[model samples]
Target: NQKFFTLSNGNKIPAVAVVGTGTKWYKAEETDATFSQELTDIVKLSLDTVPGIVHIDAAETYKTYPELGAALKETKKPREEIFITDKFSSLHKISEDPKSALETALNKLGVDYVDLYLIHSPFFDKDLNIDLETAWKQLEELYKSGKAKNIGVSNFTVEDLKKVLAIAEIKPQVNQIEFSPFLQNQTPGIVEFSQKNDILLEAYSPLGPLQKKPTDADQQPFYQYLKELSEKYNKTEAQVLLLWVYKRGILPVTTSAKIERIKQAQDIFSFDLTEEEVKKITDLGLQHEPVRLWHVDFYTKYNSEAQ
Candidate 1:
């Protein structure tokens, strides 16, 4: 049976699918009901979805939620069944109202009620620094008003979640973090935190185990192991890795462009990983580098710890 997780909003999502923050590439505004730029397409990163999978998680609408809201309306896609998740941007000001966030998201996506809305990060302060209370309360209000189906947090640590939980009227339903074999954060208590409270754990950079080859020193050994293990199991290394995530009962996302890759992505649905293999990979987190390129905090001024 396909595994699914119930959202804080009470809706459920397929264990995995093509999800992203709208586009890996963002553009500058060029028009105001006058001149404009064509809707430039992205490299189509998150194509690892199986057809008929629950839905797509997109954050592109967050910057211009109303614009995407409009697009969704014109597409005539079923809104309720398909989840529309948006995030609040750190660069967008902490005082950014969730109503404006949802209103704009709906107007941009061309929809009314979004299935989920996330905090975008545990840390994001601009100008005077974003007041988590102000930003979070805005989202909570939206949840109460029916403007949002779920309220989530991204790039947050267990400590971050708990801090919010203390004063939050409603708890966060999901936590999106940079995750992979190279950077498998042991959920740092977050996993149990989620399970106990019935929250869902969402992962980004699910390839921590198999880091981007060109840059990682351990790629050869890891890939060799992947190839060998897949051979023994009569499965592709790619499928093995993806299945590992599913086995954990946590939702993981994949990014790709090749149609063949997309087709192959659906193959895991028919197979399963062995318990021994799951433990092997789970242990990989403790003994290896655990990549974390998205660890933008230390690298930038506006990091998760920025003021």
Candidate 2:
């Protein structure tokens, strides 16, 4: 039961993907060989165990490229068989030049090219003085150069995406964002705009609700609903969350250090959720305020500006 989503550019992306090597397990300062080996082991396990997971969602901020590169080599998997998605981080001076940033990423990953490359965020305007239009032009050049098979953006709002789209020579093919039922209303028309533009939306943190405290007064009902669905479908709550993301036509990127959990994540394709169940989840999610785990300030600023 393999599933694939065709990007606007006609490139096929897997329905689900394993995200960056579990970053929470290690410290930011710990880039030692032991840390590398642990991350490499997780990547290797995901590659070897997950049935249809060919995509590896990575970013410069994640600092897992080297480990991922090692995993590809150690697993003896043909490079062509893997679909690698990388991001251009604007935190460094090198990011002033998107080409250089992507080159640096390629060097670290030891790969000739990536299947998908994204501007990590729209904050490049505020952080690096590089506007989204200029940054996108550089990504277009990379796409034409064949180094990045597909180019897109991440954490971009409808306003930001419109600015890029107005002058884009090649439309962005994907937009990676933190999405879940609990955060469905966070970005307002982002999902609709992406769908209207034929840009695929990749959902990160689809299981964010699981990370929230079950005892939270406002979120309890949503948590309870997930539990009920899990029991009804005989699947884990995590699987139920991911299935909602998939059924919404968004690609869900998830990660786990445990091989069993990794395998369990990919097993969502085995069963299907009813249409009513999907809508009910969305309705229940909207009953409470949106809960966003990442980029809180960025979203908050934009959401306020929209008012």
Candidate 3:
């Protein structure tokens, strides 16, 4: 669950990504029932479990978007009431035809339009060159036609953003990134660019290692800060960490299967962290390099290719 962040347009959505995987429109297993149950639960979090959770982010590169569509249908939720996001990705598909890829993704979603759509990565072709104008022009067409209400990118660096902005008729509304305290200082340039552009930054993994088990020794100081803040605020460590992102005015995306955790995800507006504490934790985070939860080495190449 999350609070709302208004898009450049007149729409709003919850800031968090309720944690789950894909639906029955496309199956990841040998049986459909198993897949169906899982997908239904994914939609249920936003629809029922977490009442205010209307924002859902998904992708066409995986089966998540299709299953998201199926679950929404099975659950019988009003389509217009929820905010849905899907991405057009994979080099071959976009290069072949971004319009076709997004249309296919829309078909899989079983929706007329998405609240937001994004290019999954900066890399789009075999030569590492991203055809921003070609791809963005198609996205712009979708926005104009109401296929996607908002357009943006994921895993894009400042350089990639500059390339897209150079030719994009409509500026991107968001930039979804692997953000956490650990990556706090590594990409000041990206943050600076996004701030100057008024593009809201959405953090996909703001709680990164704070949730990991076999806790890292080097992160103890940061953990200590969180524990102290949690105690002072009378909130859990997760809430404390999330509030840290909120205070920065950046939206944090987090998820958990536990019902209690899902409920806890939304309870962050009642407290405040002292400015000094935030600075201390931030300083500690900069001591380590950016923390990439998934595909540790993959992001490096993604950033490099954009450059």
Candidate 4:
């Protein structure tokens, strides 16, 4: 069954999405035919095979626009049928205009407008001279201009959200972040604030615990628990992990080059986790300290302030 979450703006987004090309796995600067073809193939595979996975999570920082555009064209899927989510990069220079950056993204994606556009991170305000209010106002302008159908943020802390909320004429509809059971207790209040405000929280790296090495001492017990659950549900640990995210009412953005993995990810909707089962995972995760794999510096800086 296909699952969707209605945004505060009344836009419906798929509960899960296949992540697009990113710097972690692919070289952004490489333009070789082989590199482009590999990425395009993976995107096309996800689009062609996965059920209810019409949404594609992408970002300018990922350097995947052109490849994603090619994938869309190759799949012959109507632009209206595919939901493309992109971001305004935090790494862009302060002097560069967000408008221009978005225009470039549009041109590269070969699309007129993205379904959702996000401020990649609060770092634009922290490291750049731009204030959060001013940055949000720029997003508001983009939204008003109709280039970005929906506006949101990524990796934003509670304080950062507050700054934007105070000045936003058009409130952010989503906040994408690194979230998983392992990080259940980290960045407290973000999940609650998002739910209370009706800002959909999109979870990236929802399978963080599985990403660790098998020998990672702290994660051994967590793995064992997941194994038990996997056997009990007759599902892969990854699917069980995604089900945990779904049961919490969060959208998960996951990526894999293998078609089998992509198909397995969509199978999460086939089974349900009991409330006790969900809480058990949370409790097990809480027993260990927060394990954040991405944007460590942001958490390091903000988590201290939170304490």
List TM-score per model, in order.
0.78, 0.91, 0.83, 0.90
Worst 10 residues of 4 by lDDT: 298-307
Question: Per-prediction RMSD in angstroms?
Answer: 5.0, 2.7, 4.1, 2.7
TM-score of 3: 0.83
Candidate 1 vs candidate 3, lDDT winner: 3
Provide the lDDT at 89 for model 3: 66
Best by TM-score: 2
lDDT of 1 at 205: 67
Superposed Cα deviation of residue 148, candidate 3 (Å): 0.7
Per-model lDDT: 0.60, 0.79, 0.68, 0.78
- Residue-wise lDDT of candidate 3 within 159-197, one digit each (tens)? 888888899889888887777777652244676678678
lDDT of model 3, residue 201: 80
Residue 81, model 2: Cα distance from true site in angstroms: 2.7
The 10-residue segment of model 3 with minimum total lDDT is: 22-31
Q: In angstroms, how far off is 216's CA in candidate 4?
A: 6.6
